[PDB]
Design a protein around this nucleic acid. Structure first.
Ligand SMILES: [K+]
Ligand SMILES: [K+]
Ligand SMILES: [Mg+2]
Ligand SMILES: [Mg+2]
Ligand SMILES: [Mg+2]
Ligand SMILES: [Mg+2]
Ligand SMILES: [Mg+2]
Ligand SMILES: [Mg+2]
Ligand SMILES: [Mg+2]
Ligand SMILES: [Mg+2]
Ligand SMILES: [Mg+2]
Ligand SMILES: [Mg+2]
Ligand SMILES: [Mg+2]
Ligand SMILES: [Mg+2]
Ligand code: NA
Ligand code: NA
Ligand code: NA
Lengths: 203, 53, 50, 61, 83, 117, 49
RNA sequence: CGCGGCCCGAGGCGGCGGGGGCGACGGGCGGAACUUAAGCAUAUCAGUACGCCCCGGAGGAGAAACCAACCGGGAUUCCCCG
RNA sequence: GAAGGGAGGCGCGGCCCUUCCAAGGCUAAAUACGCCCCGGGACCGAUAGCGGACCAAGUAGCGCGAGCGAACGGUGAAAAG
């Protein structure tokens, strides 16, 4: 029941004990680099829930990202077209901060396979996430039927093609039925299928 | 066919007709120019078959 | 110029060795109609850019 | 060169790591690939299930 | 509408009809090593001063759902009226 | 495309002789009020029908029956209809052991199309 | 000295002027030949099995 | 003031991986204006051109926190129909 | 900022019914498609057809550069020229 106790404990983020621990952790992370290897997961139970195992080939990295909205990249803050495309500073990114951390780590470590990620802290100008990564050429990984599927060549750079959980949510794939019929198997594919001009032999 | 070159019209005021020209001054693009495209090029979306009850 | 690198000198060397006509025994061995080599150049007319 | 290559190849006949000039000729993509038995591996529970219900031959009518 | 008119609907067939203590123990233990969140203490104070509609407004503003808010108020009322 | 699809069908049928290409699938009613009184082919038999014929999902899948544990029956008439369908199919199905000589296997006929329309 | 090559879709003529197939393509030719009519597939099958 | 354990780090050695290329098809982002409205600013062109990143022989999607309202169906994909 | 929860193409509050179980993961088939190879055509026939039918074409030539970019088919049965 130990992990049940841990889970119920982690549902109370505003208690004095967890508040103190969070303050200590956020101070500690603020003195380090933006990408860093961890010796072991900071949250064992959440890592287990997301698929982590304690064997050779599983690694954990901590990633930091900045908070807030986005500003367009145009010289002197001038858009030139029609008045409806004139905004500069009030925009919001189309993908979540959790999905941006995986992209940063995947770019930094192109020889590993990304699996999942989870929240670990925030402080008012930053958020921290942890990413689970797999080494696809370690023999323990290659000879295990439970994780073998990630050694296939189609699992290359999953985060670059929006295939992780956060990318899938940004694509609208957590929904089904009414409201989700124009976005599978992808938005562009559905648009292409709905606008094709079919010209049969016996029209 | 006929649209792989770079050709633009010179304006009036040089004593030549107003069709598009290549860098050396050769006429291009128009259907009455040597090397140009068809006025209405043939396409495969023409209806080739017919229906009979 | 008179103060060149060896790299430029080697590329100009190949241009000179290639400025030749078609040999007479080649023209008749291959039954050639066009007997001039149109990849020749003349110093007074060309821009080698090398 | 052929004689020298044959001698050297006989020198590394049974080692774990041999010079890269003697390894089997493949492409990059097929070199970096799972073998056939690694693809057929299953967890034990699925192995048990797939043995108690083997494929059978039958005809209808 | 939303339903086809039929004075003998479903008269041709006969229908078929379909259809934890450990959790409470675990919750009680965690309640001793940690307290209550700051916004629940405020609701407890309001319930102690006899201001029910104020408590409902506060909970609804905090949670954003009226059913969850009423459930929370009923849950917390014991720690206020038990004194 | 017509020729290619036919060739694929023929090859697959050759590879599994004498098993039929299709599986036995249930008889269901068409949904709305507009098609209320007619039947079509469904996805798979429910567990209640199999219990009616005393079979398991593993055995059913072994002898070429499609099983759909997602579907639930809504009346007893459907259950009766599909139990009768299963009984007919079981009456008409023959099994070959690994001890049968090759000749009598050659004598078997491979069924075409939908199993029982 | 950028690691990648300079290629732009707004000019398919320059892509046409310099690209794969405008040179000898020695290694690719050899591998394609060994695959379509040769023993590369047999070797791969033996190595994997 | 010395030395053992754990923890957090540093330098080197061995064996294995990565990087770049491919006018199509595929996935993810950033993202116009000409044009139509007989003017034009919301709208349209267009979730297009183009820029950047990433695989494969296909990719993506996929076994219901689904449709429905019926004498109901039953993972995904593709075709016909409106 | 949470504990039973989600949905039923008009919002809010109340009471029912019908259906399903998010915030973790894998999966063949039916489908798309250039280069390259093979087959066919009520297609063009040297100002046409690809820019490019010619032993040397993205060649000669032009531009600081990004780029731009042609013209040129035919003796005769036999060179018996
Ligand atoms: K021309
Ligand atoms: K649009
Ligand atoms: Mg998937
Ligand atoms: Mg033309
Ligand atoms: Mg090293
Ligand atoms: Mg236009
Ligand atoms: Mg206008
Ligand atoms: Mg006008
Ligand atoms: Mg105007
Ligand atoms: Mg639109
Ligand atoms: Mg896939
Ligand atoms: Mg309604
Ligand atoms: Mg597939
Ligand atoms: Mg021509
Ligand atoms: Na790359
Ligand atoms: Na490939
Ligand atoms: Na002529």
């Amino acid at each position: 029941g130990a992990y049940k106790y841990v889970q119920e404990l982690w549902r109370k983020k505003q208690s004095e004990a967890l508040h103190y621990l969070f303050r200590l952790r956020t101070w500690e992370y603020r003195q380090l680099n933006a990408i860093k290897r961890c010796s072991h997961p900071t949250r064992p139970e959440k890592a287990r829930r997301l698929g982590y195992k304690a064997k050779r080939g599983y690694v954990v990295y901590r990633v930091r990202v900045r908070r807030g909205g986005r500003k367009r990249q145009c010289v002197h803050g001038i858009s030139y077209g029609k008045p409806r495309n004139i905004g500069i500073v009030g925009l919001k990114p189309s993908r979540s901060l959790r999905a941006l951390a995986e992209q940063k780590v995947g770019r930094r470590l192109p020889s590993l396979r990304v699996l999942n990620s989870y929240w670990v802290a925030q402080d008012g100008s930053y958020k921290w996430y942890e990413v689970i990564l797999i080494d696809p050429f370690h023999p323990w990984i290659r000879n295990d039927p439970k994780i073998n599927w990630i050694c296939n060549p189609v699992m290359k750079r999953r985060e670059c093609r929006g295939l992780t959980s956060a990318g899938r949510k940004a694509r609208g794939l957590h929904n089904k039925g009414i409201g989700a019929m124009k976005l599978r198997p992808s938005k562009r594919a559905a648009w292409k299928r709905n606008h094709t001009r079919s010209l049969r032999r016996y029209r | 066919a006929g649209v792989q070159c770079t050709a633009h019209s010179w304006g009036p005021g040089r004593a030549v007709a107003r069709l598009p020209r290549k860098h050396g001054g050769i006429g291009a693009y128009a259907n009455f120019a040597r090397g140009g495209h068809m006025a209405h090029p043939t396409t495969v979306i023409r209806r080739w078959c017919r229906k009979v009850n | 110029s008179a103060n060149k690198t060896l790299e430029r000198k080697l590329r100009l060397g190949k241009k000179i060795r290639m400025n030749k006509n078609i040999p007479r025994w080649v023209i008749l061995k291959d039954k050639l109609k066009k007997r001039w080599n149109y990849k020749r150049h003349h110093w007074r007319r060309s821009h080698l850019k090398l | 060169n052929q004689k020298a290559r044959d001698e050297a190849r006989a020198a590394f006949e049974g080692a774990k790591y041999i010079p890269k000039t003697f390894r089997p000729k493949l492409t990059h993509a097929m070199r970096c690939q799972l073998t056939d038995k690694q693809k057929r591996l299953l967890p034990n529970k699925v192995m048990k299930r797939k043995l108690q219900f083997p494929k059978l031959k039958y005809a209808v009518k | 509408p939303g339903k086809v008119f039929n004075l003998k609907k479903g008269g041709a067939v006969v229908r078929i009809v379909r259809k934890k203590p450990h959790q409470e123990f675990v919750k009680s233990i965690i309640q001793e090593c940690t307290g209550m969140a700051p916004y629940e203490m405020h609701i407890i104070e309001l319930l102690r001063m006899n201001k029910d509609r104020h408590a409902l407004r506060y909970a609804k503003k905090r949670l954003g759902n009226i059913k969850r808010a009423k459930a929370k108020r009923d849950q917390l009322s014991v720690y206020a009226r038990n004194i | 495309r017509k020729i290619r699809r036919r060739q694929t069908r023929l090859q697959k049928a050759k590879a599994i002789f004498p098993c039929p290409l299709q599986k036995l699938r249930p008889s269901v009613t068409r949904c709305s009020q507009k098609f209320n009184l007619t039947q079509r082919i469904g996805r798979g038999f429910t567990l209640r029908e199999l219990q009616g014929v005393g079979l398991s999902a593993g055995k059913a899948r072994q002898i070429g029956i499609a099983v759909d544990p997602r579907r639930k029956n809504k009346s007893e008439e459907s259950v009766a209809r599909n139990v009768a369908r299963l009984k007919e199919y079981l009456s008409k199905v023959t099994i070959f052991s690994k001890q049968a000589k090759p000749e009598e296997i050659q004598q078997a006929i491979q069924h075409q199309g939908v199993v029982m329309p | 000295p950028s690691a990648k090559m300079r290629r732009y879709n707004w000019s398919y003529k320059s892509l046409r002027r310099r690209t794969q197939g405008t040179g000898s393509m020695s290694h690719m030719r050899k591998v394609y030949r060994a695959y379509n009519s040769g023993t590369l597939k047999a070797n791969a099958r033996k190595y994997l099995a």
